[PDB]
Amino acid sequence: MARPNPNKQVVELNRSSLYWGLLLIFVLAVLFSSYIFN
Amino acid sequence: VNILGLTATALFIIIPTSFLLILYVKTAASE
């Protein structure tokens, strides 16, 4: 379009999604750490 | 193994946590 890019969009992450992501990451670590350490 | 699994676990914890914290702190400052 113009000199600025018109397709600018703002990414959002609320606190509930932060808690879900942290839970997913830590639960995956808990589940897979026994297998990774073997 | 004892230490390669250690760094794998630490990176899998920290890098997605870093990504999530970046997005959350940006959002919470926005609102």
Binding site: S16, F26, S34 | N2, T9
Partner: peptide, 30 residues
Amino acid sequence: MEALVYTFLLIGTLGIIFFSIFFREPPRIA
């Protein structure tokens, strides 16, 4: 060594649970 990692992961999961309960984003009725 690995027992430390297991205990740390479990305790961190419980901390995430604690924060998700008591420091949740409150449901706003407007």
